[PDB]
Chains A and B, each alone.
With several copies, the nearest count.
Chain A
Amino acid sequence: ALHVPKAPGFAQMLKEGAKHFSGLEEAVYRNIQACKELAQTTRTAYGPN
């Protein structure tokens, strides 16, 4: 009662360094956040100013 085992199925057959994100919160929101971060990175160099 001190460790949570990996769920049977795909979560156990996954490789060591691999990652798997599924669903809205894990994938879509994260992608939108990354794009938002990139947009903030480049935003300040827009226009004559």
Chain B
Amino acid sequence: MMPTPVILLKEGTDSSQGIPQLVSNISACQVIAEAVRTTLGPRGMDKLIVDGRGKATISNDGATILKLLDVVHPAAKTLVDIAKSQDAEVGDGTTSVTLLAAEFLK
């Protein structure tokens, strides 16, 4: 590009456009699904998450695990949001929603 002595947007504005950003979004959703993947089924396993204060949370619940995870990716937050939605409306299947959405995207 060019320096453009006076610029349009504020300095530090990061923008990503096109196919690569969509592929990165799909990859982020895959990463989010991986973090709760092994909690599904009668043979599922618990996850332990420690916050800054030092308290540990152990849960097999997908929504709880996702909430304890502090996700900042704009596209990855959608999976956490739909997990919360499933927990609110139904209360069960919060792992299945994330797995299905990530599998669709993949």
Binding site for B on A (CB under 8 A): 19, 21, 30, 33-34, 37-38, 41
Contacts and interface: CB of A to CB of B under 8 A. Distances in A.
B6 interface: yes
Nearest to A37: B8
Contacts of A19: 5-6
Contacts, number: 12
A21 B5 CA distance: 10
Interface in B1-49: 4-6, 8
A34 B5 contact: no
12 contacts: A19-B5, A19-B6, A21-B6, A30-B4, A30-B5, A30-B6, A33-B4, A34-B6, A34-B8, A37-B8, A38-B8, A41-B8
Interface of B: 4-6, 8
A20 B40 CA distance: 64
Nearest to B5: A30
Given A30-B6, A33-B4, A34-B6, 9 more contacts: A19-B5, A19-B6, A21-B6, A30-B4, A30-B5, A34-B8, A37-B8, A38-B8, A41-B8
